Nucleic acid binder design. Sequence first.
RNA 1: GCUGCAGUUAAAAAGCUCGUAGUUGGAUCUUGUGGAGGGUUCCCCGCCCCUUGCCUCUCGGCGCCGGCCCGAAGCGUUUACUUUGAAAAAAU
Lengths: 82, 129, 208, 190, 150, 84
Amino acid sequence: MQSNAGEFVDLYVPRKCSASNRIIGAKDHASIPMNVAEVDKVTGRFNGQSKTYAICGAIRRMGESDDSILRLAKSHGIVSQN
Amino acid sequence: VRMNVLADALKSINNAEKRGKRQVLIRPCSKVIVRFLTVMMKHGYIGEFEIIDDHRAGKIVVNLTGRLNKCGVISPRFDVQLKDLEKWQNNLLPSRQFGFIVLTTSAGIMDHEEARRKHTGGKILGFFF
Amino acid sequence: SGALDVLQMKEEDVLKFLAAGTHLGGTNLDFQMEQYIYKRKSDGIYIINLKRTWEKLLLAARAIVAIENPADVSVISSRNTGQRAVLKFAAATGATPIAGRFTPGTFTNQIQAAFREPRLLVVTDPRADHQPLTEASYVNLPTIALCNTDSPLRYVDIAIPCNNKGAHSVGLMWWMLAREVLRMRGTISREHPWEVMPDLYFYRDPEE
Amino acid sequence: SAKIVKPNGEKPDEFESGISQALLELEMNSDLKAQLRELNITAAKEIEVGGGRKAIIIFVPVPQLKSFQKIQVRLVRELEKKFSGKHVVFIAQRRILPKPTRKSRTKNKQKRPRSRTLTAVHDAILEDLVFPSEIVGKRIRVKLDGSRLIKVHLDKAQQNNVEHKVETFSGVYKKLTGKDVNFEFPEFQL
Amino acid sequence: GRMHAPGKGLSQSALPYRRSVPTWLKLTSDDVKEQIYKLAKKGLTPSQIGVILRDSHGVAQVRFVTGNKILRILKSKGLAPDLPEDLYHLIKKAVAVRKHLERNRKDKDAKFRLILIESRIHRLARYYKTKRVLPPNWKYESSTASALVA
Amino acid sequence: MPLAKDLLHPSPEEEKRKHKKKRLVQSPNSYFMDVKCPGCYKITTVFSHAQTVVLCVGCSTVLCQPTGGKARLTEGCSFRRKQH
RNA sequence: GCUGCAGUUAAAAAGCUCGUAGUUGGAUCUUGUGGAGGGUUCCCCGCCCCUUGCCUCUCGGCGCCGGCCCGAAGCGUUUACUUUGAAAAAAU
């Protein structure tokens, strides 16, 4: 957040979950980052740079996260036509 | 019955956004709802929206994001005279800095920020933030 | 899948899926399990798609790879069928098994001597191991498990459908899970027969 | 005639006169005259597309429009070859009115019918361009720039009648209204 | 929902979007008119008329093969009745109730239901009579009910 | 609901098995039919929910029967929709 | 408690329905382009049919070379609403 100078304030800028577009607080212990491993996709062997996600507790606790994690990987890979 | 159409409309998109959705169905499609959502789209609280056509009155479908917190209606429709304005916007908005009271004037439907630059009072419809 | 046919399901594995009856799934359904099913028979039994099983296997396994420590991907199962299977899993691949009764408080205590902080979980059957799932949402653990048609989804991030009512469906699936993580991380890769088989991930089965 | 068959539209104009002459000639010829009955136009116009091709427009008096709809395909086929290298479509012309609720002055002349209104005409124009499909659905989408794109779901029969006219029909509507339209064939037919 | 019962229900007719002919059909506008006029002679009232066309003849409805409704066609002739059948059917019912009520004074249920159907006449009358479809002096009474239904 | 489902474009009959005024566009669930049995050698056209007796001009004098919905035909085939 | 209350159990929805006054009431009847003021389309003249809707004219000015053109005169079916003026004793 900006000021007169454009100087940035706020002690931490919180992170905003992928499929809910809302922000998770300092205490919120049902919110998970989930690391998918990429592969080279020529031999199907692990190669470094991961795809990382974040999900909030609200969609987790109702049981909607399973669709969200699927759709996120469906707009990328690995998922073709499921 | 369905005395006021716009008042029944906003509660759906309010309820839907809370649960976590991104497509809705709102009926029965008034022209008043269209120009409302046009202003609400420019600022960036909702995405592009598709008007289905029927002969009966139509149906509208919306694509939305979590940026919206709540859009409400204010009914019945009171007048504003550009000195009553400051009293309204204090009660109805979380902050001076952002939030947008909507209204209709003879210069068309618009936010309050625009009406002040045209020197037009008029009838208030709803709000959002 | 992703890569064109060097990750996609082979003709071989299809026989194993059908011989272990994984395709079959129970009478009762949930509204989160509607898409995974294709259809019903003429009788009460609903036929899980095997293509849809296969895609979910991969990113599940790829997440088990994505951690840089294999000693803190804590697997859990408490059903008798799922005891022998998990024991070989976490013996072969570096992982931590928690076999039998969970003994609650082991993801939230500072006094218990079985206290652990893992990152992932891999659970068999939500409705036998509901206890670790509830405690996972107090300390930010990603979660994976094996769901059936009638098993509800709640405090899980990804499902791996299976028949899993106590069958060869169980041990086969845990074997396949351990096969994939080695194709990406290990040197077992070649994708032509591995020495270890699914004939010892199957149930103890009281002998003569 | 061949020059005074275009009233309220200005009788002299080279291209429009050259259409009328050979048009009425076909109707007078004995080769087809058992379904052609000496109708006349009221104007005509030629308008391009971004496909790099021209297409001709035929206006009619509009009570006579109904009779054109009878033959409509045989006639258009013959004139597709006779005037070749351009696409051919019929359309109708209305005397659209400003509102008395105010865009031009009223004198309490008459009510203003709601078939003589503006919006009903722009709906009726679309009905003629793709008449052989007999429009199944209409949908609209609105853009972030306040533009509008009008989807039209057509019948899944009579496809190839309109499939080589599919883009060139869209350019017609642009010139008459000021709006952008797209044509689609739907997933399924009921 | 219902205006003198507590109920709620859907059974409404639903028309297609289309509205061509559609193609398959016959009896040009004019043919349909003479087909109708014969029926009104026989005492078939506008609701019945459209049914007997729709069930056994090639029409979908007589509003897409004509530019008018079934009733307006009859009205242009001058052969329309002097009160709508809707009003008539209300009054037609309530006379038999009043007969049964005179024959049996202990049927309080019938007496109750009469209050509803009675009040429903007066409401309907106040639609037409303000719209200059009835004389502004006409009223509903026992006597006028007897004569107007005959 | 999975709480993310599409509503723009529905399935051919897995989201058009719904009530007819709860669909995106209102459709009838009725149809016409072109008949021509023998009892009455003529190409008759009849609505599916007859609501009234359809008469015959031949030896027979009945073709239909109005029940509580569709209409029970008879011993004469004659079937079509056509198109709608 | 209009802004701003409450009525399952704490004080509290007429036993139930009909019904006039009162209050409240669905959808539907116009958009793009050069100049000017502000961006990179969009918000005083005009253009597609309309553009402050018309005429009819005649009396008293402006024109141009008897003849011709355009301001003022009736008004756009009626109101609410909103915006600008006028007119508002002092003291407080």
